[PDB]
Amino acid sequence: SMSYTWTGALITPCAAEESKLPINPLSNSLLRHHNMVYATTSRSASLRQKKVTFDRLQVLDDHYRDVLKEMKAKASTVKAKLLSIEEACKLTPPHSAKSKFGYGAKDVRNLSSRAVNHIRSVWEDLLEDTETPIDTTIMAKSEVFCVQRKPARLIVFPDLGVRVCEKMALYDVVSTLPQAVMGSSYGFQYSPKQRVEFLVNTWKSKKCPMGFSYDTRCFDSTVTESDIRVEESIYQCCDLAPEARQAIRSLTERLYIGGPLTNSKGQNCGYRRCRASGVLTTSCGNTLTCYLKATAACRAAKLQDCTMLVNGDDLVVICESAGTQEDAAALRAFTEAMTRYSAPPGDPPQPEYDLELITSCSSNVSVAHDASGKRVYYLTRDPTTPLARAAWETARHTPINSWLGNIIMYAPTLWARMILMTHFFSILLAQEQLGKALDCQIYGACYSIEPLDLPQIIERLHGLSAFTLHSYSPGEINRVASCLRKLGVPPLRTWRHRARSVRAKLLSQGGRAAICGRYLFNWAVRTKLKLTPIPAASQLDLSGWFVAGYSGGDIYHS
Ligand SMILES: CS(=O)(=O)Nc1cccc(S(=O)(=O)NC(=O)c2c(-c3ccc[nH]c3=O)c3cc(Cl)ccc3n2Cc2ccnc(N)c2)c1
């Protein structure tokens, strides 16, 4: 069937859309080539519609059916809880899209009578009605990139009342079932340090390792009605409260498998028969679907001793090499099996014999050295998108600060320490806002974080070695240097000069700011301050940070 059908009504904005990086002094101090930085808008939506609209021709076989049964026998061990209205309301981000039913996210969080009454009526409707398709809004996503232009991604989501009901029935399932089913292969259970550790240990555990990333083109459009019903069959293996079992059954048929698309103007836009990006089960469903198809495809391909790592639609496989020619032919057999399963590749996969050359979750393993000179593996990425986005967030107030999440996730990197930490600490210090909590996202979930807490967070997640790394790899240094020239970012010597300046001001303030000066900026000076375990690091409630993925799931933790 067709991933989408369209009425001809346009994908419309709900307000004025900005496509150009503003010319602002603060963002200009970070990046001078502002014309290279753009935000996607509804103006490119038709280009995306064309790419995501196609017929799916899925063929399932015995290997697929065997892997499915193995996944279900593991899902059978799960006992899932039904969330109360109150618990589900508290997981709603303060700025989540308002309901069309006379209340918003603040009303949800305050447990307002109108919000609570409507959510209860939506819940009773899911229990009684197993068929009526649930309305969804289609929007063009506003995302920032560096030129060389991507069309806007399309987001599909139901009303706020429905999103609260999704949490009541499936929050516990989507949080606990993926790890029970996929074990060590579930990527969202790892912090970046644990992801680095699993990848490195997996790589070296092979006699002659071969690895590859597998990029499925427009993964959400490749997800069929059969895939969504297969996903529910896994959810149905859980011990569930009877209303949760009914709500999962009704949600699957009324929302998850497909439904009507309404634009911002309330016009009938089309119809979806594939994965909606903005529902609670997208991350979990995508991971299970990608894991199932990839595991079955590895068997068909006869790839030896596979270790997979799955994060939604992102897939990396590390296996035992059979030889160069054997590997290349087995990879083509893998791709052919994936294509039959309705998961064709974007860029055709290529076998890799160097772990540092594999990009998975838009990241790669690299090496640096700590204070003692010992090797430290850490995750890094090309800094272009992070820097373009940090320039936008400097010139405009955004609901999510990708710079803060990037510092948290990429704390050991040369670019997050020298540029991102220096830029934002300089600005926030001048603005008396180092202690002001900001929203950022970790594995799709939203967190309210004060930048002054960054040292304990970093220590906890990456270890004290994140504050001592030096002698980064030549390939890492060159990718950073080439990015700075391309975007017109000032050179690293300018960043060192700015860091020495803010470090001095941070130290003079005492308290948490002096902790920031000591740990975050020790790299900027020759006279190193002693770095000991931060007392607050050991008490950090980092429960729920690296449990599951919630991209598009409207989740607020913290
Ligand atoms: C819709 S889907 O099918 O769910 N896929 C999905 C797509 C994008 C983001 C997401 S996500 O779930 O929002 N996870 C991420 O965005 C993300 C980050 C990250 C970086 C900076 C700030 N905050 C973050 O969480 C990250 C950092 C390192 Cl060191 C390693 C893996 C990482 N992932 C997973 C990931 C998984 C798949 N593709 C990726 N590019 C990244 C999930």
What is the distance in A from the centroid of ligand 1 to the CA of 415?
A: 19
Ligand 1 pocket (Cβ < 6 Å) reads 192, 195, 282-283, 286, 311-314, 361-363, 379, 405-406, 409, 441-444, 549, 551-552
Domain ranges of the chain: 1-360, 361-558
Alpha-carbon gap, residue 98 to 86, rounded angstroms: 17
Query: Which atom of ligand 1 has the smallest separation from the CA of 314?
Result: 37
Alpha-carbon gap, residue 341 to 296, rounded angstroms: 9
Atom 27 of ligand 1, nearest CA residue: 409
Q: Which residues have a Cβ under 8 Å from the Cβ of 367 and sit 6 or more positions away?
A: 356, 375, 376, 377, 378, 473
Alpha-carbon gap, residue 520 to 459, rounded angstroms: 10
Q: What are φ and ψ of residue 352, in 5° steps?
A: -130, 135
What is the distance in A from the centroid of ligand 1 to the CA of 511?
A: 33
Atom 38 of ligand 1, nearest CA residue: 361
Known binding residue 135? Answer is: no
Known binding residue 439? Answer is: no
**Tokens representing residue 493 in the block:** 């010597």
Query: Which atom of ligand 1 has the smallest separation from the CA of 195?
Result: 30
**Vertex 318 angle, CA 411 and 237, to 5°:** 90
* Helix, strand, coil percent values for the chain (each to nearest 5): 50, 15, 35
Q: What are φ and ψ of residue 526, in 5° steps?
A: -80, -35
The resolution of the experimental structure, rounded to one decimal in Å, is 2.0
Total residue length of the chain? 558
Query: Which atom of ligand 1 has the smallest separation from the CA of 188?
Result: 34
User: Which amino acid appears at position 472 of this protein?
Assistant: Y
Alpha-carbon gap, residue 283 to 553, rounded angstroms: 8
Query: Is 45 within 8 Å of 140 (Cβ atoms)?
Result: yes
317 sits in which H/E element: strand 314-320
Q: What are φ and ψ of residue 156, in 5° steps?
A: -130, 120
Query: Is 299 within 8 Å of 198 (Cβ atoms)?
Result: no
What is the distance in A from the centroid of ligand 1 to the CA of 87?
A: 25
Q: What is the DSSP string of 463-506?
A: -GGGGT-BS--HHHHHHHHHHHHHHTPPPHHHHHHHHHHHHHHH
The experimental method behind these coordinates is: X-ray
311 DSSP 8-state letter: E
Alpha-carbon gap, residue 188 to 192, rounded angstroms: 10
Query: Which atom of ligand 1 has the smallest separation from the CA of 219?
Result: 3
Query: Which atom of ligand 1 has the smallest separation from the CA of 408?
Result: 22
**What radius of gyration do the chain's Cα atoms show?**
24
Query: Is 414 within 8 Å of 491 (Cβ atoms)?
Result: no
Return the half-sphere exposure (C-beta side, CA atoms, 13 A cut-off) of residue 304: 12
Alpha-carbon gap, residue 311 to 326, rounded angstroms: 27
Q: Which residues have a Cβ under 8 Å from the Cβ of 106 and sit 6 or more positions away?
A: 94
Query: Is 165 within 8 Å of 247 (Cβ atoms)?
Result: yes
Known binding residue 453? Answer is: no
**Tokens representing residue 219 in the block:** 């993964």
355 DSSP 8-state letter: G
What is the distance in A from the centroid of ligand 1 to the CA of 285?
A: 15
Q: Which residues have a Cβ under 8 Å from the Cβ of 342 and sit 6 or more positions away?
A: 56, 57, 58, 222, 223, 224, 227
What is the distance in A from the centroid of ligand 1 to the CA of 312?
A: 8
Alpha-carbon gap, residue 269 to 11, rounded angstroms: 7
Cα diameter, the chain: 69
24 φψ region: left (φ > 0), alpha (ψ -120 to 50), beta (else): beta
Query: Which atom of ligand 1 has the smallest separation from the CA of 286?
Result: 3
**Tokens representing residue 220 in the block:** 């959400």
3-state secondary structure of 277: coil
Q: What is the DSSP string of 358-411?
A: --BTTBEEEEEE-TT--EEEEEE--SHHHHHHHHHHHHS--SS-HHHHHHHHTT
Query: Is 263 within 8 Å of 9 (Cβ atoms)?
Result: yes
Ligand 1 binding pocket mutation candidate from 213, 362, 449 (most atoms within 8 A of CB) = 362
Atom 4 of ligand 1, nearest CA residue: 283
What is the distance in A from the centroid of ligand 1 to the CA of 443?
A: 5
Query: Is 170 within 8 Å of 78 (Cβ atoms)?
Result: no
Alpha-carbon gap, residue 123 to 161, rounded angstroms: 8
Alpha-carbon gap, residue 379 to 132, rounded angstroms: 46
279 DSSP 8-state letter: S
What is the distance in A from the centroid of ligand 1 to the CA of 482?
A: 24
Q: Which residues have a Cβ under 8 Å from the Cβ of 351 and sit 6 or more positions away?
A: 210, 211, 212, 324, 327, 328, 331
What is the distance in A from the centroid of ligand 1 to the CA of 274?
A: 21
